[PDB]
UniProtKB/Swiss-Prot annotation:
The chain holds residues 101 to 155 of 215 of the full protein. Proposed to contribute to the pathogenesis of various chronic inflammatory and autoimmune diseases, and cancer. High serum levels are found in several inflammatory events including sepsis, rheumatoid arthritis, artherosclerosis chronic kidney disease, systemic lupus erythematosus (SLE). Seems to be implicated in other diseases characterized by cell death and damage, including diabetes and Alzheimer's disease. Its nucleosome-associated release during secondary necrosis may play a role in SLE. Ubiquitous. Expressed in platelets. Multifunctional redox sensitive protein with various roles in different cellular compartments. In the nucleus is one of the major chromatin-associated non-histone proteins and acts as a DNA chaperone involved in replication, transcription, chromatin remodeling, V(D)J recombination, DNA repair and genome stability. Proposed to be an universal biosensor for nucleic acids. Promotes host inflammatory response to sterile and infectious signals and is involved in the coordination and integration of innate and adaptive immune responses. Nuclear functions are attributed to fully reduced HGMB1. Associates with chromatin and binds DNA with a preference to non-canonical DNA structures such as single-stranded DNA, DNA-containing cruciforms or bent structures, supercoiled DNA and ZDNA. Can bent DNA and enhance DNA flexibility by looping thus providing a mechanism to promote activities on various gene promoters by enhancing transcription factor binding and/or bringing distant regulatory sequences into close proximity. May have an enhancing role in nucleotide excision repair (NER). It is found in: Nucleus; Chromosome; Cytoplasm; Secreted. HMG box 2 mediates pro-inflammatory cytokine-stimulating activity and binding to TLR4. However, not involved in mediating immunogenic activity in the context of apoptosis-induced immune tolerance. The acidic C-terminal domain forms a flexible structure which can reversibly interact intramolecularily with the HMG boxes and modulate binding to DNA and other proteins. The lineage of its organism: Eukaryota, Metazoa, Chordata, Craniata, Vertebrata. The modification Cysteine sulfonic acid (-SO3H) is found at C6. This is High mobility group protein B1. Residues 1-54 bind DNA. Phosphorylated at serine residues. Phosphorylation in both NLS regions is required for cytoplasmic translocation followed by secretion. Induction: (Microbial infection) Protein levels increase upon infection by human coronavirus SARS-CoV-2.
Amino acid sequence: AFFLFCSEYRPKIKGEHPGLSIGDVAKKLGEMWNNTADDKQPYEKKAAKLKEKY
DNA sequence: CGGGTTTTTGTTAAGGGCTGTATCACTGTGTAAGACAGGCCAGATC
């Protein structure tokens, strides 16, 4: 949920207000994503689709 | 043999400072013997 959600919301969250380091940026953003599945499922669905396609 | 534990295993993803090889430009020189082949020739011989 949160992994695919961060890999999806990368553009705006990384080009609007990143933070101190890429580490802390993606950490806080993945936390917010996991605390949003209820609103991030299709990103994980696309991830699993690519995984099956591989 | 196996569902669910037993302690784990990728993995794979989003960017960033440190390390470890791979390049990059750039320079040191015309010899030294030996074998064989023609060409020239300067005395040998009839």
